[PDB]
């Protein structure tokens, strides 16, 4: 498998899509956790190395393994210069 920390520079859009949470279904993948369902090709996420499939373990150091969808969204939009995402791949 693999684990990677991705640093995304940042207000405007991330160019990713998430599914999952402790409260919703990961319809594309009953796997628990928040998952990147989609990556805008040539978007911020895409370029920065993010990949469809990646499970989001943590946003700017906040454990979101067990996060709800809304909590993961909240954390992904908190204002910041550097958005740091720890993900698992494969």
């Amino acid at each position: 498998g693999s684990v990677e920390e991705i640093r995304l520079p940042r207000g405007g859009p991330l160019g990713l899509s998430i599914v999952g949470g402790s409260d919703h279904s990961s319809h594309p993948f009953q796997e628990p956790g928040v998952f990147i369902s989609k990556v805008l090709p040539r978007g911020l996420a895409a370029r920065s190395g993010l990949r469809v499939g990646d499970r989001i373990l943590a946003v700017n150091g906040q454990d979101v393994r067990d996060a709800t969808h809304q909590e993961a969204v909240s954390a992904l939009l908190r204002p910041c210069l550097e958005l740091s995402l720890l993900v698992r791949r494969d």
Partner: peptide, 8 residues
């Protein structure tokens, strides 16, 4: 469950 995708 309910699927739910958020584009960001």
């Amino acid at each position: 469950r309910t699927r739910r995708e958020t584009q960001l």
